[PDB]
Amino acid sequence: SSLAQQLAQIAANSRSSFNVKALKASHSKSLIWEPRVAVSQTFAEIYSQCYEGFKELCHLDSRFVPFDATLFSAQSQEVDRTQMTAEENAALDKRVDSFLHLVGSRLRLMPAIKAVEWLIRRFRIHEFNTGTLLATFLPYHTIPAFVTLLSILPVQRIPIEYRFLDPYIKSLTPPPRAAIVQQATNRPDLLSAISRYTLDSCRAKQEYPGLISFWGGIMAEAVNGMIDKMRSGRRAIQLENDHLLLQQIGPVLSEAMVMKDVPGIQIASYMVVAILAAKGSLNDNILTAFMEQLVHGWTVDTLRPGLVCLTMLAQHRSAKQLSGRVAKAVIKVPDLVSSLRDISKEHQVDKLANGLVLAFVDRGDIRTLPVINSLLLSELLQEKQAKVAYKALLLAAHKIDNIRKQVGSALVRLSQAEGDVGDAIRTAIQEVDFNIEELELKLGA
Amino acid sequence: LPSDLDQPIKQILIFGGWIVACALTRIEVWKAATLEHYTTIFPAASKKGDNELTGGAINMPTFLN
Amino acid sequence: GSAIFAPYRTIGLISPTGVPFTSIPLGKTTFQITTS
């Protein structure tokens, strides 16, 4: 039946109805009205009700006024989408995607549902824009409006990535987050479609906390399940699986980490980076790439979550020192040591503080000495890290060719420190076997 | 082939009406409509190594000759 | 040469050398791939 297969593909690819029963069914598919009423409704009744809904939506938010001129127009009562050309259809698709990104925040409200019902019953968005409509209803997958949209969706018009929804169309129940997350770990296409929808919204600054929390939660659980799948024990397969995970993730996180204007999606990308650095055993250069981009990316609004994710990233590294620009922007951080004590009450900041002290000591600048002194007297490092940091400081003092005055002032303050850090510093002096009084009287004379 | 060709011939490239053979440090160019020898391109260098024509030659599509 | 056996073809050999292939489009439906 190759002819029946070719004709089945033609009938599935066809878009306009060609017999009266097909026109009546396609006109009967609605969100609000039952089918027995929605068959016998002209486009003046639908436009009156749904324009009352759009008047309420346009009085709520200001930015619906171009759609007042182009989508919800009295002339747009009459336009048939299947009679315009391909470029008119593509521009109408752009206008519809912009309205759906705009209306996704208020979609629990009956004005916004009336506006989406106008788009569905006039422009047939459930058939021609199934991707954007299904993606903008996906963060509301626990509501009866999503159940009704799932009821009126055509089956073969859904994209391949959203074909987990077929049992929930056969039995009209809302799909659970376990089903969405499990299909996100199995298919990279569904995770890429959700992340592409929310990043395309957040570039147009039409974000809302429901969408941001939705994407952050599903990418966090999807990266969790994806790491638990990618783990193999064989060396070359786990190398290739880490590379495939990074190639599937990298654009999304590389944009959502440095999206400065949207701190919610920035914090959600920090959450995904923290999961990726803790659970997945990655490499040191990948973790320095993540830290350098976070350091380039933070604001004042995400500074303390950025520092938490930075503590996790620096903790799960095998190398001991940080790569420059990380230490430069953490110099630019306002209250470093007090914030690190507030984090170290719950998060073990020791390797970050050790790498910070080493990367400051590797600078020959002398505007880092209050930060070095505070990080040493902080009680954040361990005894061995404090000892090797002070040894590197005295070695830098021996390597310098003023500078030595501030160096000796810092060294005499660190030697005359009070507690266990001062005990370990004087013990480090005793095991490097070099006298205090030489450089003491050399700087005092 | 020319008489004074004592080099291997790395690649051939046909375009316009010209076929062009990058040998090793030397390009011999024939005209394709008559299949006749036309001239010989000699790149020059100051060092011994830098004259060598590794890679090859390619045409850009809308660039004449 | 020989008096009995004359060479015919080296079979079992599609691309053994460093010489790269060359592809030419025939029409709108075929490509010729030429190797050495």
Partner: protein, 119 residues
């Protein structure tokens, strides 16, 4: 060898020990210095093997094969960090100590007044 992560391990099956035992294996032990495996069974035989997966003509070749007379071997162990003596024993009321340098095997049979306590 890397430091190993807590969910999956890069374990890798190599060439097994060629000489099988005629009974159950009671004890395995590795030499503390060299890669030498000592196996001991209830069939009164200890086998010393050198760990060489890339050996020829038999991988993991046998160094020596000691049969202890009338004692089933319930346990055999190396002594010390240098791994100089092998102490081996079974159900019986004596245990041997075999020095790997100079080769002497001494059979300890008295536990100095507690021989009634140790059957």
């Amino acid at each position: 060898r890397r430091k190993l992560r807590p969910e999956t391990i890069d374990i890798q099956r190599t060439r097994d020990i060629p000489d099988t035992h005629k009974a159950a294996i009671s004890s395995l032990a590795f030499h503390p210095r060299y890669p030498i495996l000592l196996s001991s069974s209830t069939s009164s035989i200890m086998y010393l093997h050198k760990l060489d997966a890339s050996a020829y003509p038999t991988p993991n070749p046998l160094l020596t094969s000691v049969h202890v007379k009338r004692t089933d071997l319930r346990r055999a162990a190396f002594v010390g960090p240098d791994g100089g003596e092998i102490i081996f024993a079974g159900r019986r009321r004596y245990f041997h100590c075999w020095n790997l340098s100079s080769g002497l095997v001494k059979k300890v049979s008295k536990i100095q007044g507690h021989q009634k306590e140790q059957r």
